Amino acid sequence: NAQLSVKQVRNLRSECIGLENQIKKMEPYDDHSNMEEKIQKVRSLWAS
Amino acid sequence: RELADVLDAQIEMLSPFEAVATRFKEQYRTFATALDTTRHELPVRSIHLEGD
């Protein structure tokens, strides 16, 4: 039980540190604030 | 990110048509009225001419 818990904790913080490293890295763009609003115009275009 | 990309792509697919669409549909309505008139003004009941 001790070794399986140790391995599971190792895997967990491995994928954890990978996740905040990509969170630092792979996000150089952020323009979500208009997103839903643009979707409104989108269906209007479709409606047209 | 991917949803914004595909949404942006369909924005440039959809945007230029909306400005021309109003003029296009009005002139299509007028020309379809003209087509209705010219279809409604073709009398065809004749043979090789006798009299007039």
From Swiss-Prot, chain A:
Residues 1-27 form a coiled coil. Phosphorylated during mitosis. It is found in: Cytoplasm, Cytoskeleton; Cytoplasm, Cytoskeleton, Spindle; Cytoplasm, Cytoskeleton, Microtubule organizing center, Centrosome. It comes from the Eukaryota. Belongs to the HAUS6 family. Contributes to mitotic spindle assembly, maintenance of centrosome integrity and completion of cytokinesis as part of the HAUS augmin-like complex. Promotes the nucleation of microtubules from the spindle through recruitment of NEDD1 and gamma-tubulin. Component of the HAUS augmin-like complex. The complex interacts with the gamma-tubulin ring complex and this interaction is required for spindle assembly. Interacts with PLK1, NEDD1 and gamma-tubulin. Interacts with EML3 (phosphorylated at 'Thr-881'). This is HAUS augmin-like complex subunit 6. The chain holds residues 193 to 240 of 955 of the full protein.
Swiss-Prot record, chain B:
The chain holds residues 206 to 257 of 410 of the full protein. This is HAUS augmin-like complex subunit 8. It comes from Homo sapiens. Contributes to mitotic spindle assembly, maintenance of centrosome integrity and completion of cytokinesis as part of the HAUS augmin-like complex. It comes from the Eukaryota. Component of the HAUS augmin-like complex. The complex interacts with the gamma-tubulin ring complex and this interaction is required for spindle assembly. Associates with microtubules. The interaction with microtubules is strong during mitosis, while it is weak or absent during interphase. It is unclear whether this interaction is direct or indirect. Interacts with EML3 (phosphorylated at 'Thr-881') and TUBG1. Belongs to the HAUS8 family. It is found in: Cytoplasm; Cytoplasm, Cytoskeleton, Microtubule organizing center, Centrosome; Cytoplasm, Cytoskeleton, Spindle; Cytoplasm, Cytoskeleton, Spindle pole. The gene is HAUS8.
